[PDB]
């Protein structure tokens, strides 16, 4: 069932600053004590940040395109917006990939999928039983299925500090699927703190479809529910970067070239 509700309006397209967030471990390889150069589809520093300021007045999941490198951020409160189904036509006639949980364990399938206009997690307000998580409806001419580890993973409706921070990068490479993660406990009102953190290679799935467009998945509080918050979106752009690696073997200072003529001479 496209169990699709009534409070989705068109937004004001609110944009913010992309100071230094979005750095990851570029390889499996140690370095130390240099400025190392390479080029990648990265988020440009200081640039726009797509802030999606979903509150009780506005639920936010439109059509969401990939468009050549992406970045996900959410100052979570017990991990509300889990679920990534990536594909082309977002229907039965897209073999897509469903990337969801049984609240402990990552369950992923890639197949023709009954991709409804709204399937979700019908999560309650005080306890959190996903009443209507029926997303594995149909699967024919399938391709793939994957199950990770059961790990500690909370759902329920909360507020307070922005203690959880899902910082995700989902990167493609010739079908291969690169999953980065880095935890960073923060608390600003919901204005964006600046900063920088290593993102770290959780996963690969080698899938390989027409990876065009998608949506998010949230937990609809069976009146749906989001609270006084947002979530931040970026794209990647293929430019060349210089990193300053310490003797402690850590990402410490990432500096682009093409942002700034200053940054160009720095990497020069």
């Amino acid at each position: 069932r496209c169990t699709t509700f009534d409070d989705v309006q068109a937004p004001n397209y609110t944009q913010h600053t992309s100071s230094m967030r979005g750095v990851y471990y570029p390889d499996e390889i140690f370095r130390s004590d240099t400025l190392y150069l390479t080029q990648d589809l990265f988020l440009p520093f200081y640039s726009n940040v797509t802030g999606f300021h979903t509150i009780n007045h506005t639920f936010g999941n439109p059509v969401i395109p990939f468009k050549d490198g992406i970045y996900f951020a959410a100052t979570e409160k017990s991990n509300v917006v889990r679920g990534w189904v990536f594909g082309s036509t977002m229907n039965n006639k897209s073999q897509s990939v469903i990337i969801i949980n049984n609240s402990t364990n990552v369950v992923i399938r890639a197949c023709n999928f009954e991709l409804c206009d709204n399937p979700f997690f019908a999560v309650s307000k005080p306890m959190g039983t996903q009443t209507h998580t029926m997303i594995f409806d149909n699967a024919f001419n399938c391709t793939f299925e994957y199950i990770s580890d059961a790990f500690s993973l909370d759902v329920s409706e909360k507020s307070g500090n922005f203690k959880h921070l899902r910082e995700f990068v989902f990167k493609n490479k010739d079908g291969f699927l690169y999953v980065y993660k880095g935890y960073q406990p923060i608390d600003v009102v919901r204005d964006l703190p600046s900063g920088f953190n290593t993102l770290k290679p959780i996963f690969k799935l080698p899938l390989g479809i027409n990876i065009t467009n998608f949506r998010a998945i949230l937990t609809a509080f069976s009146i749906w529910g989001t609270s006084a918050a947002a979530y931040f979106v970026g794209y990647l752009k293929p430019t060349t970067f210089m990193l300053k690696y310490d003797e402690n073997g850590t990402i410490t200072d990432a500096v682009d070239c093409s942002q700034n003529p200053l940054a160009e001479l720095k990497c020069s």
């Binding site: 499996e28 140690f30 130390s32 290679p201 073997g249």
Partner: protein, 48 residues
């Protein structure tokens, strides 16, 4: 996949769980997390 020639000796470092290689100035791997749980350096220059 790494043959080579030199001297080995244990690390003094801050290694990572996914990690294997170190490539000191370039393409050298510098170190091995041994495939049965050790983490040592590399000094391929024996003496010469």
């Amino acid at each position: 996949g790494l043959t080579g020639t030199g001297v080995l000796t244990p690390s003094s470092k801050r290694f990572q769980p996914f990690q294997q290689f170190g490539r000191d100035v370039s393409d050298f791997t510098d170190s091995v997390r041994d495939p049965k749980t050790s983490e040592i350096l590399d000094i391929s220059p024996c003496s010469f």
